[PDB]
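PROTOCOL LOG
Step 1. Enter all chains and additional molecules of the complex.
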Amino acid sequence: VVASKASSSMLKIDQRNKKLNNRFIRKAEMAAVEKRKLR
Amino acid sequence: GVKYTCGACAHNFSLNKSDPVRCKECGHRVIYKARTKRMIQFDAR
Amino acid sequence: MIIPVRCFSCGKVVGDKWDAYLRLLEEGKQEGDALDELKLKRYCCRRMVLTHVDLIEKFLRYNPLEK
Amino acid sequence: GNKVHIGKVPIMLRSKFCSLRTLDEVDLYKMKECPYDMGGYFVIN
Amino acid sequence: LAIENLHPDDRLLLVDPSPVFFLRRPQYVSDG
Amino acid sequence: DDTITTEDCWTVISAFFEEKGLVSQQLDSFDEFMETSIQDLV
Amino acid sequence: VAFPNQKEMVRPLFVFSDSSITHPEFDLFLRELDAEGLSVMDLRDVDYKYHQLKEMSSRS
Ligand SMILES: [Zn+2]
Ligand SMILES: [Zn+2]
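Step 2. Run joint prediction.
Step 3. Record the structure below.
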């Protein structure tokens, strides 16, 4: 394929952002559900 | 008399209104006309 | 298709900051911090770089029609 | 008595009998096919 | 090291002069 | 174990769309018609 | 192909140059032909060659 530099950078950014989202959103949801439970 | 371009190998050639519509070197059935030689001007707006 | 030259709302030139924005995002900076580092204060300008989709990288993958 | 030809059945794109089921991502560009195209339709005339 | 490796009391010293579930980080390839 | 959150539901949905796709029913029906239906009609 | 003075040679097409044959070149070719004892193509044969090329180039 020989992808361009911009496309490779975008792929790396996408992988990092996917990992960060999968971590942070799940953590925030877990934080919220326990508070909603104890109320 | 008028240039043409093949649709696969992008090879320039010409036809005389009697040759079969075909690329001379790869035998593709789809060819395109070449751009006009006139001046093209745009208003940049 | 490709990054607009000027911001639609005000008119700031944002067309020269796409490569710098991608470089900053490559280094791990967050999108807000990257936009702040480029001195994009107004959110009208920030939406131009933040929501741009780069489609020319998909059009360029097709074999050129001439040679 | 052997393989007698009874007709031609139109082929749904990207189905098992389509030529684009194979060809991976790179060759899909050489055939001037959009990788985002999903198939599921016929091409009549 | 990062902010996590900082001591909790030293983290308390980092006062602005938490993530929210509905602010995603933008992507370009999506999925499917 | 551990609880299942909304993000896990979206992971499962992503798996669904990775396997099936959005027009899987059309292609599956046509493949069924070509593979076996023509022979049985004959 | 073959030079008159020299011997037979098998050459590829790209060796020939699009530039026109100069007067000293044709003079040397004539001198080599005279040394070997050969003649030049007849004007009738020259016209026949010209017609052959014109038919071949304009053929469909
Ligand atoms: Zn061709
Ligand atoms: Zn602006």
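Step 4. Note key features.
Chain C touches chain E through five residues (CB under 8 Å).
The radius of gyration of chain C is 14 Å.
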